[PDB]
Amino acid sequence: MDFTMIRLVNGSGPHEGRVEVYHDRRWGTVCDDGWDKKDGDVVCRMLGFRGVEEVYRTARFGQGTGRIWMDDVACKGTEETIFRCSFSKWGVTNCGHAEDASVTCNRH
Ligand SMILES: *[C@@H]1O[C@H](CO)[C@@H](O)[C@H](O)[C@H]1NC(C)=O
Ligand SMILES: [Ca+2]
Ligand SMILES: [Ca+2]
Ligand SMILES: [Ca+2]
Known part of the structure; x- marks a missing residue:
């Protein structure tokens, strides 16, 4: 069910984009x-892709709005869901949306 609470926005296709997660009834x-x-x-496999092609820092696919839910994500890389990786307390970050993270998944 965790796959319903992650999404990739504003990419060239559903395999890539700004990472957004669903927490407390908000993306x-x-x-x-x-x-x-x-x-x-971990994100890519959650969404049904074979794995990650590359990740991007500094709002490569644009800045989001609203909450920054996750910070200091420390996945081992083999987790079945990002919500079992180590990360910040929900919504507690030293970031702005200029730092929103992105990914391109291996697909094509
Ligand atoms: C979407 O990503 C592009 C870069 O590929 C970025 O320039 C643009 O701001 C982003 N779109 C939004 C919603 O602004
Ligand atoms: Ca941080
Ligand atoms: Ca990490
Ligand atoms: Ca940073």
Whole structure:
């Protein structure tokens, strides 16, 4: 069910974009602090892709709005859901939306 609470927005296709997660009845973004291919691989597999192609820092697919829900995401890279990775307290970040994280998943 966790796959319903993550999404990729404003990419060239559904395989890529700004990462947004659903928490407390709202979509919010993910800070790029410590954002790396281990975290991206977890996101990509959650969404049904084979894995991560590349991750991007500094709002590569534009700034989100609203809450920044996750910061300092520290996935090992093999988790079945990003919500079992280590990360910040929900909504507690030292980030702005200029730091919103993104991913391109291996698909094409
Ligand atoms: C979407 O991403 C592009 C870069 O590919 C960015 O320039 C643009 O701001 C983003 N779109 C939004 C919603 O602004
Ligand atoms: Ca940063
Ligand atoms: Ca941080
Ligand atoms: Ca990380």
